[PDB]
Ligand binder design. Structure first.
Ligand code: Y01
Ligand code: Y01
Ligand code: Y01
Ligand code: CHT
Length: 419
């Protein structure tokens, strides 16, 4: 069949990244300056942590229905839903700048959480539908890097945008309103652009494989049967548990980073955001390097196990070096830990995909993400309680123990797959 590539693809991809990026920002805007918000709303730190945990909670039940909707109705509807939900949540947050309106901010965060479900699955679908065979991998990498950059910007900007001024409540409200209004304006512009230019599919197929897929009639897929078959594979279950543990540890560290840093470094919220951004950027670099290393070696289990062990070592180093009262040490430790942790994620994801080659990639991706969300919620709750009661060291040691368990599980995995 005739195959052509149009410039619109890039626009589409760009737009997606942007309205993915903002979403990631909204995930971590509250946590990085949680203490300040704790002062503004007169709530507990658990209230602020739930603003991060709602993203994880919403994904698990709605992912599979969201995947079914994406398959049945196409990419355009999913993109529109995600962008509109993000914009509406941003506006609701804009309407929540008051000491007695924490529930409005929670509603906005819930809307953004529902939006996230419609965004995480779009990268590969867009890359296939709009990009040629050579550019699929690069398009997907850019799409995911958009969300990761959004997380980094959420780590960095809010500390600067909203200085901690409990003495002056009006100034704090003004800064919070400014941040919310900026996010809302960006989200609204991105939603308008998605509506205007986010077409369902290109005029001509981008590749022969996509041409065959579009030409081929749709086929019914049993998500429940696929999940049951996937759970039958013990190696897949072990890899799911390990990936969930790693991603949940990352989420817990991100959510509670401000609480950990403020314990020993008071008045360093900006430095905490810088540490988070360094962690995320080192994670991006480590992900790229690990992808290249896996491509060159063609080894999955060995590379994944080495990366897991290095992540555990970095976690231990960060755990037992936070109290030295040297901010630069925290910077370096967080950079190394993010490098290794984020490098693990693509390796484990690709290992899961190849282990379950007969099964659909979408179902395995949904299972991996749901395990990540569940482990993130559990780790966030446990580590927050440990930090509140016994101090950050207890929660960090808890994370290290879970990482050791994950290392054991990864070692136990049996796989002859090579690639
Ligand atoms: C629509 C989808 C995205 C699901 C929406 C679920 C949320 C609205 C729920 C899930 C868990 C809930 C939280 C579960 C536990 C708590 C702790 C709870 O704390 C207390 O009551 C004690 C506070 C104190 O120690 O003084 C306050 C409500 C809160 C944050 C809840 C707020 C509402 C949450 C975030
Ligand atoms: C990683 C470990 C720690 C937790 C693994 C939990 C999963 C087995 C859960 C998480 C989300 C669940 C799904 C959430 C929603 C649905 C939709 C639900 O839809 C229906 O009720 C109709 C199904 C049909 O059309 O037959 C079917 C079960 C399913 C796929 C659930 C199956 C079980 C899942 C995959
Ligand atoms: C796989 C799952 C089921 C493992 C769960 C293990 C947890 C129950 C462990 C992991 C980290 C442990 C904590 C690590 C460090 C400490 C500090 C320790 O502090 C003290 O009061 C004694 C030492 C001191 O004086 O500092 C008290 C126990 C506690 C909270 C530990 C309690 C038990 C925890 C939470
Ligand atoms: C996937 N994110 C990191 C964007 C949110 C986790 O709840």
């Amino acid at each position: 069949p005739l195959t052509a590539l149009s410039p619109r693809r890039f626009v589409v991809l760009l737009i997606f990244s942007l309205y993915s990026l903002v979403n990631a920002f909204q995930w971590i805007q509250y946590s990085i300056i949680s203490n300040v918000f704790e002062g503004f709303y007169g709530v507990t730190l658990l209230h602020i942590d739930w603003l991060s945990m709602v993203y994880m909670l919403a994904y698990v039940p709605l992912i599979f229905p969201a995947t079914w909707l994406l398959d049945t109705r196409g990419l355009r509807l999913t993109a529109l839903l995600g962008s509109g939900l993000n914009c509406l949540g941003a506006w609701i947050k804009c309407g929540s700048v008051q000491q007695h309106l924490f529930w409005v901010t929670m509603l906005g965060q819930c809307l953004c959480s529902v939006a996230q479900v419609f965004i995480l699955g779009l990268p590969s679908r867009i890359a296939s539908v709009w990009f040629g065979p050579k550019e699929v991998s690069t398009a997907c990498a850019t799409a995911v890097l958009g969300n990761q950059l959004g997380t980094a910007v959420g780590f960095l900007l809010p500390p600067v945008l909203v200085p901690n001024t409990q003495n002056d409540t009006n100034l704090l409200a003004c800064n919070i309103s400014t941040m919310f209004y900026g996010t809302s304006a960006v989200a609204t512009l991105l939603f308008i652009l998605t509506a205007i230019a986010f077409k369902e599919k290109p005029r001509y197929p981008p590749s022969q494989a996509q041409a065959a897929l579009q030409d081929s009639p749709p086929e019914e897929y049993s998500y429940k049967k696929s999940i049951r078959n996937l759970f039958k594979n013990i190696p897949f279950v072990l890899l799911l548990i390990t990936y969930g543990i790693m991603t949940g540890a990352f989420y817990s560290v991100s959510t509670l980073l401000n609480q950990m840093i403020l314990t020993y470094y008071e008045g360093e919220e900006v430095n905490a955001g810088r540490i988070g951004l360094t962690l995320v950027v080192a994670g991006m670099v480590g992900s790229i390097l690990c992808g290249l290393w896996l491509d060159y070696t063609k080894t999955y289990k060995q590379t994944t196990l080495i990366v897991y062990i290095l992540s555990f070592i970095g976690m231990v180093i960060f755990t037992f070096t936070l109290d030295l009262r040297y901010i630069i040490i925290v910077f370096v430790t967080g950079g190394v830990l993010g490098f290794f942790m984020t490098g693990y994620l693509p390796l484990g994801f690709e290992f899961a995909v190849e282990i379950t080659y007969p099964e659909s990639e979408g179902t395995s991706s949904g299972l991996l993400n749901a395990s990540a969300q569940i482990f993130g919620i559990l780790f966030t709750l446990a580590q927050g309680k440990l930090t509140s009661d016994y101090g950050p060291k207890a929660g960090n040691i808890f994370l290290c123990v879970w990482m050791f368990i994950g290392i054991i599980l990864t070692a136990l995995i049996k796989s002859d797959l090579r690639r």
